[PDB]
Amino acid sequence: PQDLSEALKEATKEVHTQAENAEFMRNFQKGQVTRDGFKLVMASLYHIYVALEEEIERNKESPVFAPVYFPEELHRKAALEQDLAFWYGPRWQEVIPYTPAMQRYVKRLHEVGRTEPELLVAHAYTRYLGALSGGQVLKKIAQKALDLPSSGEGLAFFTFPNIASATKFKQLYRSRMNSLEMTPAVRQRVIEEAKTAFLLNIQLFEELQELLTH
Numbered sequence: 285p286q287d288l289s290e291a292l293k294e295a296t297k298e299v300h301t302q303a304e305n306a307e308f309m310r311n312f313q314k315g316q317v318t319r320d321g322f323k324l325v326m327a328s329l330y331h332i333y334v335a336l337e338e339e340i341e342r343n344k345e346s347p348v349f350a351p352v353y354f355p356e357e358l359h360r361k362a363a364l365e366q367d368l369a370f371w372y373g374p375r376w377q378e379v380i381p382y383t384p385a386m387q388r389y390v391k392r393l394h395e396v397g398r399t400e401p402e403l404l405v406a407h408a409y410t411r412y413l414g415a416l417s418g419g420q421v422l423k424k425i426a427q428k429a430l431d432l433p434s435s436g437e438g439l440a441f442f443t444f445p446n447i448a449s450a451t452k453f454k455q456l457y458r459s460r461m462n463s464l465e466m467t468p469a470v471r472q473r474v475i476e477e478a479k480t481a482f483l484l485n486i487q488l489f490e491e492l493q494e495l496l497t498h
């Protein structure tokens with residue numbers, strides 16, 4: 285399509301469904317998520333967002349990313365740190381897993397941020413817009429399956445405190461993406477990078493499912 289935002293949505297519709305169809309995610313949607321499974325997901329998110337946000341900070345002034353730089357509204361690292369301390373305890377940093385599939389994703393994020401910054405928007409799009417769109421759905425399913433105590437911690441990741449209206453912000457974020465100027469060749473690679481992001485997620489889901497079925 286014309287607008288990059290619409291192009292991305294349309295181009296990733298298929299892989300998004302593939303993600304929804306992933307065995308690990310099928311069970312999650314069926315409400316069959318376990319505490320051990322959720323912990324692995326949260327650990328994965330921590331590594332992914334740490335890498336993504338390190339690269340965003342590196343390229344925040346670049347014309348290829350500046351337009352979609354919203355640190356206060358979107359940063360998730362601090363929220364995940366809070367959540368992991370709850371899920372894995374005070375020594376979470378020493379015990380959280382960092383698996384090969386998580387590493388593959390992190391490696392690509394750093395590769396992009398350091399050598400193909402123009403493609404970082406694809407990763408920011410897939411992570412942030414995804415979390416902002418289906419985050420509520422996924423969160424509701426989680427808490428109603430995890431039967432968490434009432435300790436007031438563990439799911440901060442699912443709440444963006446600095447965004448008053450998700451609908452308003454999503455429109456703003458899409459507008460900024462559409463403001464980005466890139467050659468057709470680059471735009472093609474951004475679209476492809478977005479699909480790659482989903483694929484990295486899917487391979488991660490396959491790995492986590494394998495680790496949990498022993």
Ligand code: HEM
Nearest residue numbers: 292293303304309409410411413414417418421481482485
């Ligand atoms: C358990 C599986 C998942 C569910 C149930 C889910 C659910 C949703 C929902 C309800 C939407 C809103 C669609 C709309 O705006 O009308 C959405 C959008 C989106 N999701 Fe997911 N999602 C899942 C997994 C993922 C994954 C793995 C990623 C990231 C790799 C992701 C990335 C996105 C993106 C980028 C959008 C934004 C679409 C747009 O451009 O408007 N989702 N998701």
